[PDB]
């Protein structure tokens, strides 16, 4: 019951090409997601060095906090709300109960949406 | 000079009207206002960065040196020769002779003893539409008055970057008093101006106290450390 | 004891959905909780830096002031009155006592209610 | 002009009928009225926030210039070129030239020298019905009519923001008279108006006294400061 | 001394025992807003003070507060049952010159107007 | 396929036509050092394999390299012109289950950096 | 190679004192468990800075990453 279609690079291109543009550019920039791309790097570098097949309760604690920080950021921003509901990130964060393998697929799918975000439009240098 | 020295200027920066150095982002994460302030990641105290204090003093001195010579300086490589040897540029004086430092709030327990429930207030402002007479409310956060930060600033006496067209030379005893007169003048313009944002509407008035120079490394002359403290006494 | 359940993020989603409507747009705003959210953040920044499992007497008299500002704020507003009763914030504040990890448990549950309040509500988002 | 300068305008603001700025609205004490007033977060003194003082004078000046030219200024950045010169905008004059300040109460000891107990009174008001007259009550809090505030603002004379296609210059001495003439014209309009609050029901009548200008930084042209003190002589 | 250590628990039982008419709570929160604005200024100057013993001016202000609790309870039947049940005239005689007796009194006083609004309708 | 036979003379056509600015060039090899190290660790591992179909442990190494080319081109201006004029991003999308298709990309990538450094006196 | 003789015998040069007597080491963060106990989410902070153009009064936002204050590194140095 995942949103990832086992390719996740075509799917990460089917999201950024469908984002609602404005008169000039996209309504979503990458400076609005810096607080969420900094918390997802701490989950990647912690779950990678773990040898177990299920998450530690100290590692499972900071997935609930990333789940709450996504809801708060999507609540006070219109462009982040239309981006979270398009990719399917808040429904996927409730699928990671304690699986290390389903947490690593989220971090691969997260940075395929950032790579095409820098590429598909200017004003990202 | 015929020596090497490092002079350290210490003092106290106090807050008269409410101060807001904004952060934009930066993880407050629980019901925070739309305009937060810059804090510390570990001690969670309000702080004043060194970029806000260096960049505000440099533009106030380029306005004074620029208007007194009828020349508008449009970039920091076009500034006066007394500004670029103190703050630095990327063509001739590669590194500045001044090192600014970040400051944190010191008198937290003094403010809690006098009855402060929070270290920052939330101010409700309100823009009024001129046609429908409606209300566009907003919430702003700023450091409360009476807060006190520890001020520190280092000065260096060496050769610098003596490029291949010139020979190397220490600064004389007339160039060091000429530099400390520009420091004391530039800190007196900040007291007749603001620090941070929203300053034309009343924010960010500061004041300097107990400025004093001290030779931390090396040897100065006998009648030089009392001439540098005579310049800092006019602030 | 323990009016906050584990997996509190699911419990906070059902609290905000169970609020009265009043023509779609909610009766409760986050502006009515502004004097309460600025005190819980000051309490969370002081309990986190501590180390002992028992609260200091300079920290146990800020919990008693916080649970007397909740009662006063729920008394003169009817939107805040039902929200305090629906979430059980006064019963948890009386049962904190002196332990460090029933105060941090209260503040993590407090963040999830404000996070779901801005998400499930239009006439917001600026 | 000829050089860089900062002009400090000091004075005194005294309150004639009871003032209620009242931008707290929830942040104030627990034993308080429904609509409380703005207080200092540390010393609990009543205050004037400086954003309300700037926005009221810009609103009164946009109606004086809008009745002499017979146009309705719909929003800021559409104002006159004399209001957008000393107050800011975001189009071609990006910064103010006028720095307002927050103002605490000063004569607290002079009020307890007389027979005053609380710094703020509590006034009960009524709303009667024009048929079978029944009334509902409300309670208002306002600063007492003996209070005095230390009014001040700064004025800056420099190049400013010249724009990308222009040749920068300093404002001439004839233009500083027309800036100070519009300040004292906008301060005489405030003595007829009410500075925040109810106002049309008798609140906030205010008075200015002892307005004088200085030269805080840099010299002036000569026989220019005394004719800026004459524009401020008629309030 | 009458004020306990956990003052919030005993300040709630005072409000539950106040007398009531065919409705409830004849004493309102508007009948003592002249007593609440004098208490909320004694709390400010006592907090800003640094010395432990009170000033001479910080005793003439406490003594004026005690003559208002009898001049308002005299001309009001609902107030004088509240002052005698909460014991506000007994606590003000204990505060001779100690600062922490004042701040413990002002914390207990503002915990009574908290449960005065919460334990009834008719107040917004 | 986008890669033509005799790619060595195709690789000289790409480097000869580039946005040569007021200096010599505008693209430097320090701007693609991260990409040149992930390719060299892929070519030196797919050559030592035996099966014609690529392993699933090598299938996700092509996927991380494809995301890496997308992120670098959107970040740097001078490398965005290089990846489309040479046709590299529409070549990584074809290597699904073929070992020899991976070697055609890596052999063509080696000839591009050889002429990149030889045809300017700034790099070495 | 033009430094003082007291400099070139501790740090080394290529003409007279071919190898220095001091051996410096690389150091990494040690109190990583002490920082996370006191409520530090990430080991680095992202600082937002600005560069105001003096002609048009416009902002130029940049983002810098830096190690937070309070960190500790186990210093080491060997003399021979």
Interface of A with C in 26-85 (CB under 8 A): 64, 67-69, 71-72, 74-78, 81
Rounded Cα distance between C50 and C69, Å, is: 24
Residue G56 contacts D, CB cutoff 8 Å: yes
The secondary structure of residue C33, as a DSSP letter, is G
* Resolution given for this structure, in angstroms: 3.1
Rounded Cα distance between G56 and B38, Å, is: 26
CB contact under 8 A, G46 and B59: no
Nearest C-alpha in G relative to D89: G57
Q: How many CB atoms lie within 10 A of CB C34?
A: 17
The pairing of strands B120-128 and D5-15 is unpaired
Within 8 A of G46 by CB-CB distance, chain A residues are 34, 38
The secondary structure of residue D36, as a DSSP letter, is P
Whether residue F92 contacts residue F66, with contact meaning beta carbons closer than 8 Å, is answered with yes
Whether residue A12 contacts residue A4, with contact meaning beta carbons closer than 8 Å, is answered with no
End-to-end CA gap in chain E:
35
DSSP characters for chain A? --S--S--SSTTHHHHTTS-B-SSSBS--SSTTHHHHTHHHHHHHHHSS--SSB--TTTTHHHHHHHHHHHHHHHS-HHHHHHHHHHT-HHHHTT-SSBHHHHHHHHHHHHHHHHHHHHSSSS--
Rounded Cα distance between B176 and B156, Å, is: 10
Residue C35 to chain D, least CA–CA distance (Å): 6
Nearest C-alpha in A relative to F62: A9
Contacts for B122 with CB less than 8 Å, ≥ 6 apart: B33, B139, B140, B141, C34, C38, D27
DSSP collapsed to 3 states, chain B: CCCCEEEEEEEEEEECCCECCECCCCCCCCCCCCECECECCCCCCEEECHHHHHHHHHHHHHHHHHHCCCCCCCCCCCCCCCCCCCCCCCCCCCCCCEEECCEEECCHHHHHHCCCCCCEEEEEEEEECCCCCCEEEEEEEEECCCCEEEEEEEEEECCCCCCCCCCCCCCCHHHHHHHHHHHHHHHHHHHCCCCCCCHHHCCCCEEEEEEEEEEEEECCCCCCHHHHHHHHCCC
Whether residue D157 contacts residue D1, with contact meaning beta carbons closer than 8 Å, is answered with yes
Q: What are φ and ψ of residue D193, in 5° steps?
A: -95, -165
Q: Testing the interface with E: which of B107, B115, B116, B145 to mutate, by most E Cβ within 10 A?
A: B115
Dihedral angle computed from the Cα positions of residues B59, B64, B65 and B67, in that order, rounded to the nearest 10 degrees: 110
Residue D88 to chain C, least CA–CA distance (Å): 24
Q: How many CB atoms lie within 10 A of CB D123?
A: 15
Rounded Cα distance between C112 and B30, Å, is: 9
Rounded Cα distance between F59 and F62, Å, is: 6
Residue G35 contacts B, CB cutoff 8 Å: yes
Helix (H) or strand (E) holding D15: strand D5-15
Which residues pair with residue D155 across a beta bridge?
Answer: D7, D98
Which residues pair with residue D99 across a beta bridge?
Answer: D154
In angstroms, what is the C-alpha Rg of chain G? 21
Rounded Cα distance between F51 and F46, Å, is: 10
Nearest C-alpha in G relative to A43: G42
CB contact under 8 A, E110 and C76: no
* Neighbors of chain D with 3 or more C-beta pairs under 8 Å: B, C, E, G
Signed CA dihedral, A71, A77, A80, A82: sign only: positive
Query: Is F71 strand, coil or helix?
Result: helix
User: Where does chain D break, by residue before each gap (C–N > 2.5 Å)?
Assistant: none
- List Cα–Cα distances, E2 to E7, E92, F118, in angstroms: 10, 11, 93
Within 8 A of B142 by CB-CB distance, chain C residues are none
Rounded Cα distance between C112 and C110, Å, is: 6
Within 8 A of B62 by CB-CB distance, chain G residues are 54
CB contact under 8 A, B30 and C111: yes
Residue G65 to chain C, least CA–CA distance (Å): 23
Q: Which of B25, B42, B74 sits opposite G69 (nearest CB)?
A: B42
Contacts for A46 with CB less than 8 Å, ≥ 6 apart: A59, A62
Interface of B with D in 61-90 (CB under 8 A): 63-64, 66-68, 70, 72
CB contact under 8 A, B27 and A35: yes
Q: Testing the interface with E: which of D31, D122, D126, D138 to mutate, by most E Cβ within 10 A?
A: D31
Where do the H-state alpha helices sit in G1-80? 5-8, 32-37
Among D115, D118, D62, CA closest to D87: D62
Rounded Cα distance between B109 and B79, Å, is: 43
Residue E102 to chain B, least CA–CA distance (Å): 14
Residue E16 to chain C, least CA–CA distance (Å): 15
Whether residue B16 contacts residue B206, with contact meaning beta carbons closer than 8 Å, is answered with yes
CB contact under 8 A, C35 and D27: yes
Nearest C-alpha in E relative to D120: E37
Rounded Cα distance between D213 and D231, Å, is: 10
Nearest C-alpha in D relative to G54: D161
Residue D24 contacts B, CB cutoff 8 Å: yes
Q: Do chains G and E touch (3 or more CB pairs under 8 A)?
A: no
DSSP characters for E74-115? TT-HHHHHHHHHHTHHHHHHH-SSBHHHHHHHHHHHTTTTHH
CB contact under 8 A, D101 and B202: yes
Rounded Cα distance between B146 and B107, Å, is: 9
Whether residue A73 contacts residue A80, with contact meaning beta carbons closer than 8 Å, is answered with yes
CB contact under 8 A, C41 and B43: no
The pairing of strands D152-157 and B206-218 is unpaired
Q: Which of A64, A67, A76 sits opposite C125 (nearest CB)?
A: A76
Q: How many CB atoms lie within 10 A of CB C1?
A: 6
Rounded Cα distance between B50 and B54, Å, is: 6
Residue B25 contacts A, CB cutoff 8 Å: yes
Among C28, C54, C58, CA closest to C42: C58
């Amino acid at each position: 019951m995942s949103v990832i279609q086992d390719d996740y690079v075509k799917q990460a291109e089917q999201v950024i090409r469908g984002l609602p543009k404005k008169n000039g550019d996209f309504e979503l920039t990458t400076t609005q997601l810096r607080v969420l791309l900094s918390l997802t790097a701490q989950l990647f570098d912690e779950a990678q060095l773990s040898s177990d097949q299920n998450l530690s309760p100290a590692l499972r604690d900071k997935v609930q906090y990333l789940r709450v920080r996504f809801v708060y950021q999507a609540g006070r921003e219109k462009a982040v709300r239309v981006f979270v509901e398009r990719a399917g990130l808040l429904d996927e964060l409730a699928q990671i109960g304690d699986s290390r393998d389903r947490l690593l697929k989220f971090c691969h799918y997260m940075e395929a949406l950032v790579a095409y975000k820098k590429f598909l439009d200017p004003k990202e240098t | 000079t015929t020596s090497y020295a490092k002079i350290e200027i210490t003092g106290t920066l106090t807050v008269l009207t409410g101060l807001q150095i904004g952060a934009g982002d930066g993880f407050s994460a629980i019901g925070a206002v739309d305009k937060p302030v810059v804090r510390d990641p570990l001690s969670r105290l309000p702080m004043i960065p060194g970029t806000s204090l260096k960049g505000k003093v440099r533009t106030l001195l380029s306005r004074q040196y620029g208007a007194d010579t009828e020349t508008f300086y449009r970039k920091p490589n076009e500034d006066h020769a007394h500004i670029r040897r103190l703050f630095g540029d990327t063509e001739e004086y590669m590194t500045g002779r001044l090192v600014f430092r970040d400051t944190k709030l010191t008198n937290k327990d003094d403010l809690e003893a006098r009855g402060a429930k929070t270290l920052t207030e939330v101010k409700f402002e309100n823009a009024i539409n001129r046609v429908t007479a409606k209300a566009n409310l907003r919430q702003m956060e700023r450091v409360i008055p009476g807060s006190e930060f520890a001020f520190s600033l280092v000065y260096e006496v060496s050769f610098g970057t003596p490029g291949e067209e010139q020979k190397a030379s220490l600064p004389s005893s007339d160039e060091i008093i000429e530099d400390f007169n520009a420091i004391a003048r530039g800190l007196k313009l900040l007291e007749l101006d603001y620090l941070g944002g929203s300053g034309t509407r009343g924010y960010g008035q500061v004041k300097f106290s107990n400025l004093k120079a001290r030779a931390a490394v090396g040897a100065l002359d006998g009648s030089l450390l009392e001439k540098l403290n005579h310049e800092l006494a006019a602030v």
